[PDB]
Amino acid sequence: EVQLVESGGGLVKPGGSLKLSCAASGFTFSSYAMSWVRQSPEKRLEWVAEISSGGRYIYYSDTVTGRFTISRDNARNILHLEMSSLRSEDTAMYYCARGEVRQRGFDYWGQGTTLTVSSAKTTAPSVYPLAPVCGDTTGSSVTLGCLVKGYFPEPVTLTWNSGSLSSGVHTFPAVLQSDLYTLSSSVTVTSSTWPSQSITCNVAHPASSTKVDKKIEPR
Amino acid sequence: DERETWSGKVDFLLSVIGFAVDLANVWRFPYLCYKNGGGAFLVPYGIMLAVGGIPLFYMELALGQHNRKGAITCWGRLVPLFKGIGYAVVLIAFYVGFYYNVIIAWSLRFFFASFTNSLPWTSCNNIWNTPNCRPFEGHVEGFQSAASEYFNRYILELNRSEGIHDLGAIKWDMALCLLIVYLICYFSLWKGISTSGKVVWFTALFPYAVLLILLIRGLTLPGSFLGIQYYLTPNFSAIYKAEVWVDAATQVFFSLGPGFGVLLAYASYNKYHNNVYKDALLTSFINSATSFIAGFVIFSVLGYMAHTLGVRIEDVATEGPGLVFVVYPAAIATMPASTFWALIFFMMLATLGLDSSFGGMEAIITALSDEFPKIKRNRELFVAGLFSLYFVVGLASCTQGGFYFLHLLDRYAAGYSILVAVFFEAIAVSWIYGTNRFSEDIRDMIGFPPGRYWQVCWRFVAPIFLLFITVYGLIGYEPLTYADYVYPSWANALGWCIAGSSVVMIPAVAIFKLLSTPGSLRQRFTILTTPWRDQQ
Amino acid sequence: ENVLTQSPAIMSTSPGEKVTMTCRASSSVGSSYLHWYQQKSGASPKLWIYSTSNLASGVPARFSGSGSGTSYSLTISSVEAEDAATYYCQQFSGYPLTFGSGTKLEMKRADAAPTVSIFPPSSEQLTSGGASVVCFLNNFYPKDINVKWKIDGSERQNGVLNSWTDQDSKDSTYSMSSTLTLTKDEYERHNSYTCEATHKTSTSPIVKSFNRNE
Ligand SMILES: CC(C)CCC[C@@H](C)[C@H]1CC[C@H]2[C@@H]3CC=C4C[C@@H](OC(=O)CCC(=O)O)CC[C@]4(C)[C@H]3CC[C@]12C
Ligand SMILES: CCCCCCCCCCO[C@@H]1O[C@H](CO)[C@@H](O[C@H]2O[C@H](CO)[C@@H](O)[C@H](O)[C@H]2O)[C@H](O)[C@H]1O
Ligand SMILES: CC(C)CCC[C@@H](C)[C@H]1CC[C@H]2[C@@H]3CC=C4C[C@@H](O)CC[C@]4(C)[C@H]3CC[C@]12C
Ligand SMILES: NC[C@H](O)c1ccc(O)c(O)c1
Ligand SMILES: [Cl-]
Ligand code: NA
Ligand code: NA
């Protein structure tokens, strides 16, 4: 019933500034204190700021004070976070959490919104299809691959045969190396299905308005 | 603002317990039970307590701890348009000081009178007695009991005064007793809550030592169970009559003293994150619990009086100073080791009152020390001057007709004044400051907001609870009279000026600074309804 | 700042066993202010236990809490697979609000050797100027695995990218991808490429190779 939706925030250059928002629905927003909690890429939870029910009491983390401004709009049921002079350390997924009673905790969290603070430049990925080498075969199932190399920032979304094929797929999380992400994925299917039916890799990188499909052919 | 703080939390709890528990817990609550259906009286008493009393009690405790200032500064920073509320509350506390302590003097006078082998108020053959004296209480107006004549003809000498005009001589034994109470109050409120909060240890706890002794002594007397019967046996027929609901409502309001300015001052020295909600519920319960325990101490001896001493229960189940200075001492003087009971009983009465005096005076000292730094710098001097004005003017109550003067203040100093003051306190808090803005302040202190129960009581019940009192209090109004004496109509007016000198500060101050700020009508009705902290 | 340290950081358990994790604070915390959150791989945190001992709504009864002062603990009576997650404690009694370092609870299963697959550079990539030969090591247990690349017979240690998957929610296995990247010139100046995987399940490594002809 209660819903929190973070929004805004993507790539920002160091020193820049950006503004996050949280849409509240399902409860009397004006009656509950709200906090922002971020989770670094190293998966560490860190509280950043809290604003009281009527905005008259505001607390900040030491690591953010002076640069971030938390604010409230009980008329439209929106929570904001104004960030300025950002640094790479601020890169994280920013959560919007409800927490009126200190003795009960944060009883509702949003889906999160990601902030990447980096002077790196956006780039689209090269998507290469991975097909086995002529040899053994002679197995019930074979495995194919798809290499998404050298993109930025996150994220990219990868599916096989537009989502029809899901069982037997491993999409490994991306790994940053010198300001460029690489990401791979593998599918395995019974020999009686490939190359009988066509198997295609569908990569999507909205940051660079990329949308590519790569059919795996055994050349 | 490096405000000091209670050296320990018990200093605050006992200070609050002490201010709340006073003679009214002994000489009014048990009487109301006996008069309004015994145990059944607890139904309207508990309801008025849960729905009107404890809410308002809780409210002021939270305001004091949150705004961390005395009464004048607090309401000024809360809503400026009603800063007069703080002035009314301080003036009312000032007036009641002129008569509340002389009742403590009476206790010392009787205390020093008990250092004897046989108590004086026992027999009817003394220089002060009349031929119409009788050994124990009766029900004919012209025939007083031995203890009545002692209190009236020897201690007070009230028989030599024709009314408020004829005051007469100054009983210097009473004046000496009055000074001994202001001396005790001085070196207690002397250097702030640093020592205040410690003296309260003896004055707030000693009454429970004596209540425990007298409770055993009384319940082990022939006929004591008969007293417990008149005290409690239910008769829920009383619940139906509206006179018992206003009786419960009024006793609950005046026994907790919510919005009197002292709970505010006491709480303003707490640490900002003290769980003042747990404090309000704890102390408010201990107050009513003490009244309940006291009713057994009283009526156990009352039944003993009616069973062994042969008197009508209606002739000794009285209220007010008559019960503690006439009826109960009479029974004490009739039991073995009377000198011991008399000495600890009158000592209990004394320590029951001191606590409440401390609180009323601190309300003034703190409220002024927070609004005029000249006072805060010279604390020892201010109270020295305050108590001196008290004592000097108090000599008019150590006179022979002092009771007539003191009786006047009792019915006018704070009687209706404090009711309209607390009504505006509730209106200001919930409707002009805002219950949400107030609940938000409590959330920041104790970590959670007040429930909707407490919010509904602050916003609708409290104002109705207080009107329910003031309305029925005006409906039962009759001119001032003690026994056959009718106060002259000029005295009846003198009291209304005392009643108005506090309440007028509310509209008066609302008019003064309503013109002292610049802007439009609405632009100023909002510059004077914006809280102080909402300015930074 | 009141730093809360949790131990262990990772811990495996077979369904049915009893699990306990601890949360040690650097400063005393009021029992009424210590809370626990559960975060599943890929989702957002969910309030799990508040005031030390109270289960949040929807939290099954096999979860319990206890502690006081500076030592608290979350305890699972009989762990189920749906309990694999990271658990964060948190104190709400002092600013700044601080979360614990977290305990990651993973499921224990029987050992399983990986199924390795080697993939030579895509034809598209070879024309862009580069050459990446990737290698998948799929569905193995436990999580620790070691990969080694050889060009001809000499092993190549430089220019590798390894990635692990989270523990699979169906068969509780792990998978790992490893990509070797060279220039097209360097790649076409060699013959056979080899992907050796070392794992606890085998005494000697699983090998997969290919020559740039077949
Ligand atoms: C003979 C003497 C001991 C009489 C003593 C009676 C009172 C001590 C009892 C009787 C009715 C009780 C009240 C009954 C109902 C409540 C509502 C309750 O409100 C709540 O719901 C608490 C949770 C919340 O709303 O935040 C707070 C306690 C209170 C005032 C109780 C306070 C203690 C009261 C006044
Ligand atoms: C530790 C320091 C204490 C500070 C000083 C105490 C101040 C109180 C003074 C009260 O004055 C005395 O009160 C006695 C109380 O009764 C009177 O005794 C009167 O009553 C006695 C019996 O109670 C009789 O024996 C006496 O003759 C008769 O004077 C006595 O006359 C009177 O002067
Ligand atoms: C039947 C009667 C006589 C029993 C007497 C009950 C007495 C002992 C009760 C009533 C009020 C109680 C006090 C109320 C307040 C506190 C603060 C608490 O933090 C310490 C205990 C303390 C100081 C209590 C001590 C016990 C106490 C004094
Ligand atoms: N219950 C406390 C008693 O009513 C009281 C004592 C002294 C005061 O100054 C006061 O306002 C009230
Ligand atoms: Cl009472
Ligand atoms: Na009282
Ligand atoms: Na008292």
Residues C144 and B488: their CA atoms lie apart, in Å, by: 102
- Cβ pair B67, B429 in contact under 8 A: no
Of A105, A108, A135, the CB nearest to C35: A105
Of the three residues C107, C139, C161, the one that is the final residue of a domain is: C107
Q: Exposed (0-12), middle (13-18) or buried (19+): which is C170, by Cβ within 10 Å?
A: exposed
How is residue C114 written in tokens? 């990986």
Listed in sequence order, the residues at least 6 apart from C134 whose beta carbon sits closer than 8 Å to its beta carbon are A130, A145, A147, A184, C118, C119, C177, C178, C179, C180
Residues B329 and C41: their CA atoms lie apart, in Å, by: 79
Residues B90 and A67: their CA atoms lie apart, in Å, by: 46
- Read off φ and ψ for residue B78, nearest 5 degrees: -85, -65
- The verdict on C10 and C102 lying in the same domain is yes
- State the distance between the two ends of chain C, measured CA to CA, in whole angstroms: 63
Q: In terms of DSSP bridges, do strands A169-171 and A113-117 run parallel, antiparallel, or are they unpaired?
A: unpaired
CA dihedral B360, B361, B366, B369 (to 10 degrees): 150
Q: Closest approach of chain A CAs to the CA of C92, in angstroms?
A: 6
Using a 6 Å cutoff on CB, does residue B113 contact ligand 2?
Answer: yes
Within-domain flag for C115: no
N residues, chain C: 214
How is residue A142 written in tokens? 């074979």
Q: How many interchain CB pairs under 8 A, A with C?
A: 137
Listed in sequence order, the residues at least 6 apart from A91 whose beta carbon sits closer than 8 Å to its beta carbon are A40, A41, A115, A116, A117, A118
| Domain enclosing residue B423, as ranges | 1-536
Task: Please provide the DSSP assignment of C3-60 as one string.
Answer: -EEEE-SEEEE-TTS-EEEEEEEEEEE-GGGEEEEEE-TTS--EEEEETTTEEPTT--
- The verdict on C94 and C133 lying in the same domain is no
Within-domain flag for C58: yes
- The verdict on C10 and C63 lying in the same domain is yes
User: How many other C-beta atoms are found inside a 10 Å radius of the C-beta of residue B131?
Assistant: 6
- Cβ pair A86, A18 in contact under 8 A: yes
Give the residue from B77, B438, B440, B535 with the most A CB atoms within 10 Å of its CB, the best one to mutate: B440
**A residues 157-216 closer than 8 Å to B (CB):** none
Residues B422 and B86: their CA atoms lie apart, in Å, by: 10
How is residue B448 written in tokens? 């959670």
Q: In terms of DSSP bridges, do strands A18-25 and A78-83 run parallel, antiparallel, or are they unpaired?
A: antiparallel
Q: Exposed (0-12), middle (13-18) or buried (19+): which is B220, by Cβ within 10 Å?
A: exposed
Of B440, B533, B534, the CB nearest to A52: B440
Residues A44 and C100: their CA atoms lie apart, in Å, by: 9
Amino acid identity, residue A190? T
The DSSP bridge partners found for residue B252 are: none
Ligand 6 centroid to residue C156 C-alpha, Å: 89
Listed in sequence order, the residues at least 6 apart from C132 whose beta carbon sits closer than 8 Å to its beta carbon are A128, A147, A149, C121, C122, C125, C179, C180, C181, C182
Chain centre to alpha carbon of residue C31: 32
The DSSP bridge partners found for residue C164 are: C176
Locate the DSSP E strands across A15-89. 18-25, 34-39, 45-51, 58-60, 68-73, 78-83
Residues A77 and B294: their CA atoms lie apart, in Å, by: 54
In this complex, do A133 and C128 lie within 8 Å of one another by their Cβ atoms? no
- The verdict on C74 and C146 lying in the same domain is no
Structural determination approach: X-ray
Residues B403 and B282: their CA atoms lie apart, in Å, by: 37
> What SS3 state is found at C177?
strand
Of B436, B444, B449, the CB nearest to A57: B444
CA dihedral B442, B448, B454, B460 (to 10 degrees): 60
C144 conformational bin, left if phi > 0, alpha if psi -120 to 50, beta if neither: beta
Position of tokens 């800063």?
B83
Residues B524 and B534: their CA atoms lie apart, in Å, by: 16
Using a 6 Å cutoff on CB, does residue B181 contact ligand 2?
Answer: no
Our CA angle for B452, B453, B456, nearest 5°, is 80
Ligand 7 centroid to residue B104 C-alpha, Å: 11
Residues B306 and B316: their CA atoms lie apart, in Å, by: 8
Q: In terms of DSSP bridges, do strands C10-13 and C19-29 run parallel, antiparallel, or are they unpaired?
A: unpaired
Residue C64: C-alpha distances to residues C6, C75, C95 (Å): 16, 5, 26
- Cβ pair B398, B175 in contact under 8 A: yes
Residues C206 and C118: their CA atoms lie apart, in Å, by: 11
Q: Which residues of B touch A56 (CB under 8 A)?
A: 437, 440, 533-534
Q: In terms of DSSP bridges, do strands A113-117 and A11-12 run parallel, antiparallel, or are they unpaired?
A: parallel
- The verdict on C101 and C14 lying in the same domain is yes
- The verdict on C12 and C102 lying in the same domain is yes
Our CA angle for B48, B50, B52, nearest 5°, is 55
Nearest atom, ligand 4, residue B261 CA: 11
Give the residue from C3, C36, C104, C117 with the most A CB atoms within 10 Å of its CB, the best one to mutate: C117
Instruction: Give C54-58's long-range contacts (Cβ < 8 A, gap of 24+).
Output: C56/A107
Q: Which residues of C touch A61 (CB under 8 A)?
A: 96
- The verdict on C167 and C82 lying in the same domain is no
Of A54, A102, A104, the CB nearest to B436: A54
| Overall domain count for chain C | 2
Residues B151 and B106: their CA atoms lie apart, in Å, by: 9
Residue A142: C-alpha distances to residues C107, C123, C124 (Å): 28, 20, 22
3-state secondary structure string, B247-283?
Answer: HHHHHHHHHHCCCCCHHHHHHCCCCCCCCHHHHHHHH
Q: Which residues of A touch B448 (CB under 8 A)?
A: 100-104
For CA atoms C3, C9, C14, C20, give the dihedral sign. negative
CATH of the domain at A97: 2.60.40.10
Q: Backbone breaks in chain C (C–N > 2.5 Å) follow which residues?
A: none
- The verdict on C87 and C161 lying in the same domain is no
| Domain enclosing residue C12, as ranges | 4-107
Residues C197 and C208: their CA atoms lie apart, in Å, by: 9
Q: Exposed (0-12), middle (13-18) or buried (19+): which is A164, by Cβ within 10 Å?
A: exposed
Position of tokens 């000499």?
C154
- The verdict on C99 and C132 lying in the same domain is no
> What SS3 state is found at C132?
strand
For CA atoms B515, B518, B520, B526, give the dihedral sign. negative
Amino acid identity, residue A207? A
Give the HSE-up count for residue B204: Cα atoms under 13 Å, Cβ half-sphere. 25
Q: In terms of DSSP bridges, do strands C103-107 and C10-13 run parallel, antiparallel, or are they unpaired?
A: parallel
Of the three residues C63, C78, C107, the one that is the final residue of a domain is: C107
In this complex, do B448 and A30 lie within 8 Å of one another by their Cβ atoms? no
Our CA angle for B347, B351, B352, nearest 5°, is 110
Residues B5 and B196: their CA atoms lie apart, in Å, by: 12
- The verdict on C12 and C86 lying in the same domain is yes
Residues B145-167 as b or e (16 or more Cβ within 10 Å = b): bbbbbbbbbbbbbbeebeebeeb
Within-domain flag for C113: no
B462-475 and B242-256 helices, crossing angle to 10°: 120
| Overall domain count for chain B | 1
N residues, chain A: 219
| Domain enclosing residue A86, as ranges | 3-117
- Cβ pair A96, A3 in contact under 8 A: no
Give the HSE-up count for residue A145: Cα atoms under 13 Å, Cβ half-sphere. 29
Residues C17 and C62: their CA atoms lie apart, in Å, by: 11
